[PDB]
């Protein structure tokens, strides 16, 4: 994809005690036009791992199709071996770089949440194959708005609980709804823990417009 | 930038090339030779872009030599010229187009002397006289003035002198010395290099 059509905006992410949580609004924007206001930009990869995607939805849906089949292909063998959160993140770095290096990139910026062997994984990958780990992540315009607020809290308290992390993420998506033009007030939160991958939604943030009387 | 000239006679062909191998603003060699021996009775004079001239000329040279070894007789100037044209015409609409301007002077035993002309497009033209480079714009009208079909070789060198002296007088590029060669019945003959003060 040289020119993307139906883009999704910011995907958030943050580690907590015994798990990881990610959030992403359910909007596919056709430029300025909010075309598709009910589409899931988050994906259950396997029991250990989940994947949220900014950028072009057709390229994300291709990656969803390819990953889904890889996880199916793995689960056929049933030999006590699974793709870890790091392993999917490693593959996806090599996928985007290979497509970048053929000058036919998948126009996406993605966040990979996961929990396995006691440890929390949160991993960034973009269209060019730039990848890393961090205690929080925010793709797209959320890098400039939301990531400041996550690093503010994580300076004062490095290790959060699930409720601390969830109520923080709800506070972030409120700021994105106000300040990001390409966002919407329908979103999904997706947590991962020992239990597995939950995908809760559709949700909304309670807004406030009292500053309009000043 | 470089300069070639050919003058066909009744039973011979006079030719001459400059000897500057230029680079940017510098005259790297004053003694450079731009003529390539195809056969005993054929010279290919070649000018153009730096690496293109020698690579093209030598590819032709070796295939003309291959024709000699294969069959026990050399190509005629007509055959050699159309062979040169066929290669340059096929490269024209391809990945590696050779930007080369060239004269093929020769002597056939049956057909007599022949001077051929060819631009980088690979249009072949038989001519009584011709010239390549920016120097041709000054010197071609001198050949129109003083050339006749029955010109003697000793006079044809004095005609050549007037062209080469006009380059020293009017052409902005240096070109101090020139290679000179005649082809006839008895093959290729070197002559004194027309140097100046």
């Amino acid at each position: 994809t040289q020119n993307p059509m139906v883009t999704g905006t910011s995907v958030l992410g943050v580690k907590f005690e015994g798990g990881v949580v990610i959030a992403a609004d359910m909007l596919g924007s056709y430029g300025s036009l909010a075309r598709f206001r009910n589409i899931s930009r988050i994906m259950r990869v396997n029991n250990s791992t989940m994947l949220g995607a900014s950028g072009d939805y057709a390229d994300f849906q291709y990656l969803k199709q390819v990953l889904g089949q890889m996880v199916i292909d793995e689960e056929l063998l049933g030999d006590g071996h699974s793709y870890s959160p790091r392993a999917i993140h490693s593959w996806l770095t090599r996928a985007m770089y290979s497509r970048r290096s053929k000058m036919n990139p998948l126009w996406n910026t993605m966040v990979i949440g996961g929990y396995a062997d006691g440890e929390s994984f949160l991993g960034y990958v973009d269209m060019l194959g730039v990848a890393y780990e961090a205690p929080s992540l925010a793709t797209g315009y959320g890098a400039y708005l939301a990531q400041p607020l996550l690093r503010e809290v994580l300076e004062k308290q490095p290790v959060l609980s699930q409720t601390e992390a969830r109520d923080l993420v709800e506070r972030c998506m409120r700021v994105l709804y106000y300040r990001d033009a390409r966002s919407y007030n329908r979103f999904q939160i997706a947590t991962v823990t020992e239990k597995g991958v939950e995908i809760e939604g559709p949700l909304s943030t309670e807004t406030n417009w009292d500053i309009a009387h000043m | 930038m470089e300069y070639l000239i050919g003058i066909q006679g009744p039973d011979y062909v006079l030719v001459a090339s400059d000897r500057v191998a230029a680079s940017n603003i510098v005259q790297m060699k004053d003694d450079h030779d731009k003529m390539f021996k195809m056969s005993e009775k054929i010279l290919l004079l070649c000018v153009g872009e730096a690496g293109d001239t020698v690579q093209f000329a030598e590819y032709i040279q070796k295939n003309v030599q291959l024709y000699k070894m294969r069959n026990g007789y050399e190509l005629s100037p007509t055959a050699a010229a159309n062979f040169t044209r066929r290669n340059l015409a096929d490269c024209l609409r391809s990945r590696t187009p050779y930007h080369v301007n060239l004269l093929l002077a020769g002597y056939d035993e049956h057909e007599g002397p022949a001077l051929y002309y060819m631009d980088y497009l690979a249009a072949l033209a038989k001519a009584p006289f011709a010239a390549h480079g920016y120097g041709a714009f000054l010197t071609l009208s001198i050949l129109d003035r003083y050339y006749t079909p029955t010109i003697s070789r000793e006079r044809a060198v004095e005609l050549l002198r007037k062209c080469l002296e006009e380059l020293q007088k009017r052409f902005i590029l240096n070109l101090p010395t020139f290679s000179v060669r005649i082809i006839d019945k008895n093959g290729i003959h070197d002559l004194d290099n027309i140097s100046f003060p």
Binding site: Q2, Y97, R100, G129, V130, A131, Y132, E133, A134 | -
Partner: protein
């Protein structure tokens, strides 16, 4: 239009002593005017006697490190021995030049130990021109650090100064002070300072803090 490169930045540095080799870097990864992450060190361990610093476009860094890691094994499988520091630096030239017409945008500095035991640094450009050095800076703050390294390690523009070789004590302190100075003046240098020290005993890693703005 689609641009396949992007500048992630960061600084790298290597020094060759008589019995050691420092290879250090910052930990900031950037894009545009935002910070991607503060824990992305540019030092990568290859063998027990060799380490490489890689800065520039991070997509190429990850790939090129993974290529070197893959090639190290392929050599060891063929030849039944680890690659020498000089042989890695020679191999890296061919990998960088194999992408002459679509560059690995990666400023590489290898540092480690030659077969004679001493320190050996090899500095690079993106398309694979290299040379052995005593010292070299690279990446974002290359220009800031290099002339100070020319001064203090090379003894350049100095007279009535005895040309004493670098102790590992002195070189470590120099690497701290130069990366402090880079962090102040370079936006793309900051957060923390990875320092890998290659001696015959092995590799050991320190982590001094830097400016987080």
């Amino acid at each position: 239009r689609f641009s396949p490169y992007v500048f992630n930045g960061g600084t790298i540095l290597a020094i060759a002593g008589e019995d050691f080799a420092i290879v250090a870097s910052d930990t900031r990864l950037s894009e545009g005017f935002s910070i991607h992450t503060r824990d992305s060190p540019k030092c990568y361990k290859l063998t027990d006697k060799t380490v490489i610093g890689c800065s520039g476009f991070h997509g190429d860094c990850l790939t090129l490190t993974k290529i070197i890691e893959a090639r190290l094994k392929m050599y060891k499988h063929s030849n039944n021995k680890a690659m020498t520091t000089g042989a890695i630096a020679a191999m890296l030239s061919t990998i960088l030049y194999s992408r002459r017409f679509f560059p690995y945008y990666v400023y590489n500095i290898i540092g480690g130990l030659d077969e004679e035991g001493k320190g050996a640094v090899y500095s690079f450009d993106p398309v694979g021109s290299y040379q052995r050095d005593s010292f070299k800076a690279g990446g974002s703050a290359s220009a800031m650090l290099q002339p100070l390294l020319d001064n203090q390690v090379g003894f350049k523009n100095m007279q009535n100064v005895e040309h004493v070789p670098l102790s590992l004590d002195r070189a470590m302190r120099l690497v701290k002070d130069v990366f402090i100075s880079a962090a102040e003046r370079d936006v793309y240098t900051g957060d923390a300072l990875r320092i890998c020290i290659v001696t015959k005993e092995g590799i050991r890693e320190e982590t001094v803090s830097l400016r987080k703005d």
